[model samples]
Target: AGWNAYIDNLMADGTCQDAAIVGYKDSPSVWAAVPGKTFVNITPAEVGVLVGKDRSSFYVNGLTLGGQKCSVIRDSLLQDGEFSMDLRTKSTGGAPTFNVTVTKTDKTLVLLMGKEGVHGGLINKKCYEMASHLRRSQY
Candidate 1:
């Protein structure tokens, strides 16, 4: 069941590059568009769901999932989650890295972002889980 959830989280849709970037928004992390780079903004609840199901690779920064579709999540800024790296360099031998740490500039919200790719929608279940957790917190 854990394995299934893990795979499901990964195969949920959307490229790892985008999922990582989409994890933060108006956050301490700054985002800009670069040619050949992809980006998206996702929900925090989605992150929590994936983390709850399989914290193994989800919770840590600089986590690498190998494949033709390689993904690495890293820590940056004051935000607890951040994703930023060069896809081409990463696909090669370069380390999957993120943006340099910056002082917290915005704290109104947390949103994820990453490079664009065929994969999209992986965050749906994560968002669902996050919502469930939030609702439970009230009780």
Candidate 2:
């Protein structure tokens, strides 16, 4: 009937494996299963962009960043030790837009956000903060 009780039961039944509850800044805390690919590849800065000042709950490849959702506009599988993924939400007008490019390698993951020559590094800084918070919260 309670959260801790549910956790205990899940752990007792072998349903919990390498799970941890983590919080990012003031954002709502989240439970994650480690060794999983969800947030393993991204950096803290990248995670910062996912949650803002009042965001209570967020999901990967689902929805966040104002009107943006986790729609992989482009998805490329790894071939010959290389792959790339893009997640973005474009705005026609009014609100700001969100865009991210993720490149995968044999040893690391790279994330690119914010376009150059437009607003410069301003938005990127916000992304960095968000990503860092996510990193800190991860188990």
Candidate 3:
């Protein structure tokens, strides 16, 4: 079967974003409200079950096999992953095309403060690139 250890390894050096729909808890509570989804923490065992031993064949279980839904494990997060953009903006007088990097931020307090969007010129660029989208993270 797949090992939960892989998640740990990946998370050790990576970024994670999670949100809540109703619960008044951590960052997500203050962050933007993600509609149509309830947030639940993923267990290591559940992750292991999904990963399994074989890379190709999937390990389906009760909570997973039934109509029950999970965002990262099967539906949204794992399926969608991350996205980075190198955009070109048009200026009134043909200005220079600058680089804009968007990233996900999960800290509840931080999210609360930056409720409008992720970037406010205070966050690290690398963090933005690796972070998950708030809507997807919550939903």
| lDDT score at residue 33, model 2, on the 0-100 scale | 22
Please give the lDDT score at residue 9 for candidate 2. 32
lDDT of 3 by residue, 41-134 (tens): 3333433433233333221322321122322211111233432211112224754322222232332111111112344232223323334433
List residue ranges in candidate 1 displaced over 4 A: 1-37, 41-51, 59-91, 100-139
Ranking by lDDT: 2, 1, 3
Off by over 4 Å in 2: 1-69, 77-82, 90-93, 115-139
Best by lDDT: 2
Per-residue lDDT over 1-139 for candidate 1, one digit per residue giving the tens place of the 0 to 100 score? 1212322343344543322222233222223222233322223443233233343453333322212232333323233333112212134475443221111122211122333332223333343233233233331
Candidate lDDT (C-alpha), each: 0.29, 0.37, 0.27
Which of candidates 2 and 3 is the stronger one according to TM-score? 2
Q: Number of clashing pairs, model 3?
A: 6
Candidate 2's displacement at residue 50, Å, is: 14
Residue pairs clashing in model 3 are 1-52, 1-53, 2-52, 2-53, 27-108, 103-128
- In model 3, which range of ten residues has the least summed lDDT? 107-116
**Cα-based RMSD of candidate 1:** 14.2
